[PDB]
């Protein structure tokens, strides 16, 4: 029938900007520049963004708007054979909501811990410390910074877990933290995009205020120029390496967030004739611009540390949670007005992650609401139920061995799941559905057909770009390990279910529906390859 639409155009954009701008923007991108060729990394990064990244991002938004339905239904109406794709994508988003919100919880945890004259992670003399603790980061693994032990031996208590097999006690400060996260998500996603679309105003915009303050604070710091030097100093030697092109391609793909049905779902609330193509480019750019800016926020502080604090740069320049919960707060505590930098820093983290979590959850609620009217009829129940399921299982993430759980999901929730899922999205759209049909759909919406540029990216470049990621990442495969702990064979295989459970939906739904329709093989292919709007 007629679905609701965004209260206003900025509600959509801030929702998409919000979903896309994420912790990866902060902890992975600047590190990738530093790691490969400095400023030169922007060359392979930019090309990968142009040919691979945005075309996928653009695709998902266009489809979501035009078919005016969530992921399950939309792919049902597009290529019924491949309706499984919709299932896969929605399923992947599902698994991720389990481990991802614990990041926001850690953020809230450090925020609550940040009200004080003296930040707890500064020194080495606390009860949780070990004799091997030192004040700042080093390159010897047995000896950890005072900030690393705070996070590890106090906040996480990971030192008390012998592996994933041993989870240990439930930390109720984290259990409480995780709850507050889902409470915030609840009364955000509660009534749908009417309220949700407003909430993103704070959670999308806040990080930029806090990036601004910390960008100034960081640049006014002694040594801050040395940092920018480490961040952006060109070396084009790196550009010649395959590893660099894989890192660029890979960061770009996971940054713009295709494959969760979130872009799809969000756009489905757009007015049919609005210019999505303008939106995809504006949203894309704001996403990468944010990562670029963020790099300065980090490495300015990173330089301050290498200058006044006497640490080797390679020791403090790192990716993932370590940068944000260990390295950066270490610098913050050394500077004047530390408590203020801490509070706004951690709030920025939480508000960086919440928009993302919102969008992912919405990809589910929307996708199911469009398939099962019973769900559509009562939203408040469904999401209360869903988040309750998230909370309960997520307590595994608040145990003492919880990180081991978090890390496991992080790898297998979708690494390869989302890569194939998008690979079928592209192949289905470009070949089975046809590009000329997609293009004709877009011209009807915007007024003009996509250039032959996008059509070549959708039909050829992207899929190649996609398996370029997977192949060069497959050959580099190594069994799951975190920090001298080697995950057991069984836990590894437990992950591959989680990985494969979504992707099988594609051939599984194809198999089921191919055998649920009559006629010959040739004529039941044509039945399942004919789109909903053609009938």
């Amino acid at each position: 029938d007629e679905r609701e639409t965004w209260s206003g155009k900025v509600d959509f954009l801030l929702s998409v900007i919000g979903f896309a701008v994420d912790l990866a923007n902060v902890w992975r991108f600047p590190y990738l520049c530093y790691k490969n060729g400095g400023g030169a990394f922007l060359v392979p990064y930019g090309i990968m963004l142009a040919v691979g990244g945005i075309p996928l991002f653009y695709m998902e938004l266009a489809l979501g708007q035009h078919n005016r339905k969530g992921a399950i239904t939309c792919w049902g109406r597009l290529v019924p054979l491949f309706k499984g794709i919709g299932y896969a994508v929605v399923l992947i988003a599902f698994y991720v909501d389990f481990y991802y919100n614990v990041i926001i919880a850690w953020s809230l945890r450090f925020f609550f811990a940040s009200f004080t004259n003296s930040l707890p992670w500064t020194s080495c003399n606390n009860i949780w410390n070990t004799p091997n603790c030192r004040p700042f980061e080093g390159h010897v693994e047995g000896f950890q910074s005072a900030a690393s032990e705070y996070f590890n031996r106090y906040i996480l208590e990971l030192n008390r877990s012998e592996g994933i097999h041993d989870l240990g006690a439930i930390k109720w400060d984290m259990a409480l933290c995780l709850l507050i996260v889902y409470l915030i998500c609840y009364f955000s996603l509660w009534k749908g995009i009417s309220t949700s679309g407003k909430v993103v105003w704070f959670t999308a915009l806040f990080p930029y205020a806090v990036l601004l303050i910390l960008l100034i604070r960081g640049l006014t710091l002694p040594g801050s120029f040395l940092g920018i030097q480490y961040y952006l100093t060109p070396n084009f030697s790196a550009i010649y390496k395959a590893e660099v092109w894989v890192d660029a391609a890979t960061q770009v793909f996971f940054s713009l967030g295709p494959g969760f049905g979130v872009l799809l779902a969000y756009a489905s609330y757009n007015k049919y004739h609005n210019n999505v193509y303008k939106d995809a480019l504006l949203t894309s750019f704001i996403n990468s611009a944010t990562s670029f800016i963020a790099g300065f926020v980090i490495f300015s502080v990173l330089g301050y540390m290498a200058h006044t604090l006497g640490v080797r740069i390679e020791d403090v320049a790192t990716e993932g949670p370590g940068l944000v919960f260990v390295v950066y707060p270490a610098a913050i505590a050394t500077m004047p007005a530390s408590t203020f930098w801490a509070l706004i820093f951690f709030m920025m983290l939480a508000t960086l992650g919440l928009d993302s979590s919102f969008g992912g959850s919405e990809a589910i609620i929307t996708a199911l609401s469009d398939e099962f009217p019973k769900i559509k009829r009562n939203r408040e129940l469904f999401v209360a139920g869903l988040f309750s399921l998230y909370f309960v299982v997520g307590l595994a993430s608040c145990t003492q061995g919880g990180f081991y759980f978090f890390h496991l999901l992080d790898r297998y929730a979708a690494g390869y799941s989302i890569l194939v899922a998008v690979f079928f999205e592209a192949i289905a759209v470009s070949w089975i559905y046809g590009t000329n049909r997609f293009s004709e759909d877009i011209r009807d919406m915007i007024g003009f057909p996509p250039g032959r540029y996008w059509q070549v990216c959708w039909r050829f470049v992207a899929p190649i770009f996609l398996l370029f990621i997977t192949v060069y990442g497959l050959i580099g495969y190594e069994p799951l390990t975190y920090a001298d702990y080697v995950y057991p064979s069984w836990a590894n295989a437990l992950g591959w279910c989680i990985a494969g459970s979504s992707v099988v939906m594609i051939p599984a739904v194809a198999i089921f529906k191919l055998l649920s329709t009559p006629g010959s093989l040739r004529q039941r292919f044509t039945i399942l390859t004919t789109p909903w709007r053609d009938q």
């Epitope: 049909r437 007024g447 003009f448």
Partner: antibody
Framework: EVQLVESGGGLVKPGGSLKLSCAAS????????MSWVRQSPEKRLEWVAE????????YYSDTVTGRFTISRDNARNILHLEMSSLRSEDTAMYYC????????????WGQGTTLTVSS | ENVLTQSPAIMSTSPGEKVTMTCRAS???????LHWYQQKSGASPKLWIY???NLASGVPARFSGSGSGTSYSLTISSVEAEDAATYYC?????????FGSGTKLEMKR
Amino acid sequence: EVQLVESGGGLVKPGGSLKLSCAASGFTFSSYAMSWVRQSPEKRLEWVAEISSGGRYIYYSDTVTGRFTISRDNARNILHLEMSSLRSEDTAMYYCARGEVRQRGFDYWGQGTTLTVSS
Amino acid sequence: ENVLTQSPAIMSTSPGEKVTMTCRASSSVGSSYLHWYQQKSGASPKLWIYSTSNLASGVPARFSGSGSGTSYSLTISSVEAEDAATYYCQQFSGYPLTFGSGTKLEMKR
């Protein structure tokens, strides 16, 4: 290079029906939405119907809606307008016009073909 | 329908003089969807200006166009007798598509 040629059309009794064709050449005809624009003897330009590249999207003016049917042959590169229960007010020269990008308007027009509706 | 009215209906001009014609829509039109056609006597229309300011292929630089919302105009800076024709404006903004009432440019002598 790009040529558009309308044909069909002539005298028809009121209430009758008739079928116009536009022969396209000089470009991939499948890549372009087309429209029929007509000009009355009083020289008023009026748009009639538009058909997409793959002819999955079709728009009509209110004046001709339900009597006229626009169609497309992408193999033979032809454009069609099938008119029924014609009225005197449908008298006009009929123009086959090509435009795909709305922001660019109609970038090529045919010579036209004349339809006269009189008892 | 969005009705586009043009003025004047007819106008005469001596070559070299500057001519201006206006187009007024009953409802607002995005400047990207407003176009202009020149039709010479006894021949078929030709796309002249598109997206309100843009000259089509083959259009002399002495032509220009401007406007927004409900009011647009086509302008010939220095007229040539070659320019005597009827000018139509069109909006591709919404269906049904509509052409303005036209302006007949005739030469003065």
